[PDB]
Design a protein around this nucleic acid. Structure first.
Lengths: 215, 216
DNA sequence: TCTGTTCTTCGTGTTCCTCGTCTGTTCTTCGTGTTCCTCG
RNA sequence: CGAGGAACACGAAGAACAGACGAGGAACACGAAGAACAGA
């Protein structure tokens, strides 16, 4: 059981400095190399760096030299980045990595974080239940959902009946452009399940709201 | 600089057929030891990716032996047969030769199945948003099997692709298809300049584009 | 033109630290082969 | 006739030693590539 853990989501201001802590379990630390990979969605992944845990050989990429700093500590069993020269194009997922040979490949990976850059202000979301055209069941199956508008932070996590309804569901992404986020989800449910089984949309949101809306 | 060529960008695979994927290098791959060290990684959507193939054909301790690796030179292949359901995700190959140890992306798994009929529905906006001076028509068009879908929006016989946002989804775990959401967002004074609202889609099973117009 | 020195990239050789690979050697156990002994 | 214990082996498992390979940094005497303050 050699797995890794990281911190949670992070929101940062432009021009600031942010940190990464990386913990693991199982075997020793100073015998191996910690390795480190970047991922931005919709685009191929990219290696960042590596640090050996005995001599601390500091070397970054041909582009990322002088940009991010890589350190570690053995007593806390932790690896550390500090990120500066911040800008909004790197709001993405960063991945900690365990070496298997001489900083040459990777064998297991941590969970990484969502490092996001803050813009505008953190607003509470506006949720709207999707109302049918005719109301009651007027066909073989009916369609319902959830329309959410006007929120800054990404953790707007959409649950039906507090974690249920994993079948016949359409989870949907959010749009980061202009700091205007729209969430639109739809569920197609059967004809004889309308008046008793009214499935509720649920936004889980730590900075703003734990909101529940019933149709 | 390091570039990699993903000539199998996508692939047709159903549950039980074969496939071969050739990650291709721009230059040679040889090392001073005479060997090459090429690695392929698997990501199921939801969890962190893990090591699958580490040198060419030998692998990680505890993986199934059903995948296989081969090749030497500038293009390197992996072969699979009798494809299961629990090994879906995205594959990655690592460049083995040059000094900047740059990753390589763009190799994903695609489940083959029969095509699916469109499901079209229209949502006029809720009154809470109508009290705020804005409105948003929603057209949900679901169960699209291929990715060549062309959407249009019409408002009283007039073509305007303005104020329109669109939302996709990835490969479903159980439905194994796509889904489509289209929102047209304007103000309430910009709403009631016209009456009928139309969403139109271009699919391949429906040999004519599907047109749906509602009134309120 | 160089030195007192400082800020950076690449080698000439050695050692320290960790590791994945390959070859020979040795100890124990197992599906079992050679003589003695024993078990029905 | 079937099998087991004692010393050796066809092949396999756990372990250790000896040598070599390369992978990553550290230290030292010297070489190449750009520069600056003062001195001769």
């Amino acid at each position: 059981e050699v797995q890794l853990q990281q911190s949670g989501p992070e929101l940062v201001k432009p021009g600031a400095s942010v940190k990464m802590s990386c913990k693991a379990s199982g075997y020793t630390f100073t015998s191996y190399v910690m390795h480190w990979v970047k991922q931005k969605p919709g685009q191929g992944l990219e290696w960042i760096g590596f640090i050996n845990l005995y001599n601390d050989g500091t070397k970054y990429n041909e582009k990322f030299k002088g940009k991010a700093t890589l350190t570690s500590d053995k007593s806390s069993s932790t690896a550390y980045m500090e990120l500066s020269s911040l800008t909004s194009k790197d709001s993405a997922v960063y991945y900690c990595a365990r070496d298997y040979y001489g900083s040459r490949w990777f064998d297991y990976w941590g969970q990484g974080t969502t490092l996001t850059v803050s813009s505008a202000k953190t607003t509470a979301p506006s949720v709207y239940p999707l109302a049918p055209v005719c109301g009651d069941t007027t066909g073989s199956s009916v369609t319902l959902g959830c329309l959410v508008k006007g929120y800054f932070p990404e953790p707007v996590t959409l649950t039906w009946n507090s974690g249920s309804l994993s079948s016949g569901v359409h989870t949907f992404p959010a749009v980061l452009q202009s700091d205007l986020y729209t969430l639109s989800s739809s569920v197609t449910v059967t004809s004889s399940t309308w008046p008793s089984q009214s499935i509720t949309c649920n936004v889980a949101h730590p900075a703003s709201s734990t909101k529940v809306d019933k149709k | 600089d390091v570039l990699m060529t993903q000539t199998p960008l996508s692939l047709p695979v159903s549950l039980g057929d074969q496939a071969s994927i050739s990650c291709r290098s721009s230059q040679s791959i040889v090392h001073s030891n005479g060997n090459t060290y090429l690695e392929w990684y698997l990501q199921k959507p939801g969890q962190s990716p893990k090591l699958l193939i580490y040198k060419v054909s030998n692998r990680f301790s505890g993986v199934p032996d059903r995948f296989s690796g081969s090749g030497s030179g500038t293009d390197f292949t992996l072969k699979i047969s009798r494809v299961e359901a629990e090994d879906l995700g995205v594959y990655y190959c690592f460049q083995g030769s040059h000094v900047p140890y740059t990753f390589g992306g763009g190799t994903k798994l695609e489940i083959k199945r029969a095509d699916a009929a469109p499901t079209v529905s229209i949502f006029p906006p809720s009154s809470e948003q109508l009290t705020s001076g804005g409105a948003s028509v929603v057209c949900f068009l679901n169960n699209f099997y291929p990715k060549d879908i062309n959407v249009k929006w019409k408002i009283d016989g007039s073509e305007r692709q303005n104020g329109v946002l669109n939302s996709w989804t990835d490969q479903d775990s159980k439905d194994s298809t796509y889904s489509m959401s289209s929102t047209l967002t304007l103000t309430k004074d910009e709403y009631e300049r016209h009456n009928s609202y139309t969403c139109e889609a271009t699919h391949k099973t429906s040999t004519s584009p599907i047109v749906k117009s509602f009134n309120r």
